[PDB]
Write a protein that binds this ligand. Structure first.
Ligand SMILES: CC(C)=CCC/C(C)=C/CC/C(C)=C\CO[C@H](COP(=O)(O)O)C(=O)O
Ligand SMILES: CC(C)=CCC/C(C)=C/CC/C(C)=C\CO[C@H](COP(=O)(O)O)C(=O)O
Ligand SMILES: [Mg+2]
Lengths: 252, 253
């Protein structure tokens, strides 16, 4: 089993053409609605389905059957993205194709910078046979704009864009440590397109670049893809009754 | 549960013990009876720990479990293992060791030796050894100085540039933000520059332990490195000879 080495999911993300990726928050979206949504993602040509949230409780009992219901509705890989908790590490369930593991390089708490990875692997394989574990996508995760919620929870400080000094240090780490992916996120604002370009030009060719946060239009998706993002994530735009119209606009 | 990667007793002792020399016994070259004779002397000098370390090893578990047990019966000092990892296995480990020094070779061109060795080692934990009997892990930034094709060929290391502080400062930023426990500055064929030691001491947090080793053969060298800010000054080869008692007395005095 690849585990922390590159596997099937990373290969699919590297070779698929760039595009939008819908993110289903499984603790806010009822499983029946997630299944209806998942059936549409497949038709649009998205590369994967991400299940992600800042908050979670009773993870294993909720997520194992939630992941199975989504997998029955779409052939796309199902990737989990959640923060770790001291004493447990990152949450995991069998059936997920991959876990996106964020190393929060801008956090003031070394647990969220990377020690969460050590706690997670110490606990591996735990309850799940090694042969059935999801693959791990080792990711540099950076936050942009004022965000006291993630700051309070994970210790993140917004990345300073007054110079490229801080991002240049993250680029050196992303390259030398052989991270698989970089995830640029803004909870309350927008990751700057020029930061996306700086990362695309500074990363190796096989390092996958995700951008998300407040993407609500196809124009925003296009601008980020033109700036070099491999995938543009969006969750909140579809957390409403008229999600089918919003999805068609974002994917158009 | 074992502290494992969290700070434990061995790190607390390294943090609080008086700075000084630390002898490193290569267990694949030094016979165990000589290691035991050495261990008794290191105890008298009040060194902080006994390191068992080597670039090379074979049949690790069967050789090291009895070797560590004999050294532990000879000294009350913590026994710390320091060896390179191997893809497919991670770092080598035996029960009985108090701690394993885990080197993140930040200057390597191979990401396995930069840090993925840590992921393979923890994945494999607990493995063949019960959780409660595992050694503590000392998370360490490991940096090499001077021409060294042996470590370059084995682990992908490139000598750290001392032409400016650009490279070193990036390693300090990582050492601090990632919360490494220790920094180990090593030169196989030359000497780590005392000024680099001082730059690291000034740049590290107060609880980050700084080790320097490589070609230390005299007490004057130990004093110079301790005066430059090293917490511990390692030495192996100086004692790999018949007149080791004289050499130890000169390095420790
Ligand atoms: C901070 C970090 C990057 C990782 C640590 C783990 C962590 C907190 C993972 C949860 C997923 C996440 C980064 C943000 C939540 O929502 C956005 C979509 O936003 P929108 O509703 O605005 O589209 C998403 O899932 O990407
Ligand atoms: C490259 C690195 C720092 C870590 C990777 C793992 C690794 C190769 C561990 C083995 C220990 C080591 C760094 C060097 C061997 O001898 C010196 C003492 O030298 P002297 O005989 O000149 O006194 C020592 O043990 O420190
Ligand atoms: Mg494990």
């Amino acid at each position: 089993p690849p585990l922390w080495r590159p596997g099937r999911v990373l290969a699919r993300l590297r070779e698929h053409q760039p595009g939008p990726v819908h993110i289903i928050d499984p603790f806010k979206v009822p499983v029946t609605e997630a299944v209806e949504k998942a059936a549409e993602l497949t038709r649009l040509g998205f590369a994967a389905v991400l299940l992600a949230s800042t908050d979670y409780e009773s993870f294993e009992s909720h997520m194992e059957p939630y992941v199975a219901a989504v997998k029955a509705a779409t052939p796309l890989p199902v990737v989990l993205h959640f923060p770790p908790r001291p004493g447990a590490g990152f949450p995991v369930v069998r059936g997920a194709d991959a876990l996106l593991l964020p190393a929060l390089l801008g956090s003031g708490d070394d647990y969220f910078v990377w020690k969460s990875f050590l706690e997670t692997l110490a606990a591996f394989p735990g309850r799940i046979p090694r042969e059935e574990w999801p693959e791990l996508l080792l990711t540099v995760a950076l936050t942009f704009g004022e965000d006291p919620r993630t700051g309070d929870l994970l210790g993140t400080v917004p990345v300073s864009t007054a110079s490229t000094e801080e991002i240049d240090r993250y680029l050196h780490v992303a390259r030398a440590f052989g991270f698989h992916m970089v995830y640029l996120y803004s909870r309350n604002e927008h990751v700057p397109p020029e930061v996306v370009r700086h990362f695309r030009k500074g990363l190796g060719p096989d390092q996958v670049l995700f951008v998300s946060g407040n993407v609500r239009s196809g124009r925003q998706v296009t601008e980020y893809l033109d700036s070099g993002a491999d995938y543009v994530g969006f969750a909140g735009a579809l957390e409403q009754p008229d999600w089918r119209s919003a999805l068609a606009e974002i994917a158009g």
